[PDB]
Subunit: 112 residues, 3 copies
């Protein structure tokens, strides 16, 4: 397992931490949503939650990443939920497929 | 009408407030985007706006929730915009389909 | 080029800054993701990043906007990544297709 702290930012201005799949995977439209492994695990920095989003270049190549919420205290593996939209998409190991964005977790009075 | 304050968080670490449809609905891919009723209404806590996102397990079962922005001062019913991606999806009353995430509303000088 | 500061908010409570395409474009499902030009350019306010999301009415009409992250220091043109989901979608110049939401850029110790 590797923690979120091992992720790298592409540029100091980059909002997202880059996520790659640990496996080579081929996706076709008829397969529907697939969960790609990243080898990266929660949990997140105190008072933050995580949002998995696609990268634009990848989206433009026909791979849709479904927005995923990562809870602050999730300790499992961060997976990228993805689907080939129109064509056959091939994800090579180490292609940066998605990005993790950290956001403030707002405290509310909602019953747990 | 029920307010956002009646929503529950699944776990103290959960970023999102769970949203269910008030109706049993069946969705097929050819139907395209559908707005599912929740019976939950804005408005939101001061200085926040809302983001509707899917839950991972639901997404993986073939129900896409389209990211929806809920304005701070929206007083209508919060609906979940959803589409079956590949197969026939059946949403039973009370299945938690989506989640509402609260985010800080940043003030800017943009003209209203 | 027009800066983000020229965008307007629909209502004081509106979380998002409205985005239109500068061109009339027709989209069919088989075209897959398309990048629509807005004529609006980064960069963003200090300590913020941007999220491009769809508007609900547009989504309901069959135009999917893929969530896009705009980095704080991006100085290029903000484009909307879009796809017609089921039917032929026609985007007239000046239709407000998407919205830009500004979010806090959280500082982390991740290696750049
Ligand atoms: O794209 C996603 C979405 C969720 N999760 C993990 C982190 C979440 O905290 C956990 C539970 O997600 P839900 O089923 O409640 O959405 O699943 C992911 O790894 N990737
Ligand atoms: O998934 C969504 C998106 C929007 N709205 C409501 C709240 C928004 O403030 C309002 C207007 O949305 P737009 O058409 O401007 O996106 O619609 C929803 O109920 N669900
Ligand atoms: O919907 C989008 C997503 C991205 N970008 C621009 C701003 C980003 O900073 C830049 C790089 O995006 P990525 O390829 O790294 O996601 O592209 C857009 O104009 N629209």
């Amino acid at each position: 397992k590797q923690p979120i702290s091992k992720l790298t930012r592409a540029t100091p201005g980059s909002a997202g931490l880059d996520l790659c799949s640990t496996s080579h995977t081929v996706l076709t439209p008829e397969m529907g949503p697939q969960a790609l492994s990243t080898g990266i695990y929660g949990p997140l920095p105190p008072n933050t939650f995580g949002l998995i989003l696609g990268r634009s270049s990848i989206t433009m190549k026909g791979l849709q990443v479904y927005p995923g919420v990562i809870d602050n205290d999730y300790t499992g593996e961060i997976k990228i939920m993805a689907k080939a939209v129109n064509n056959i998409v091939t994800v090579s190991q180490g292609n940066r497929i998605a990005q993790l964005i950290l956001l403030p977790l707002i405290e509310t009075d909602n019953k747990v």
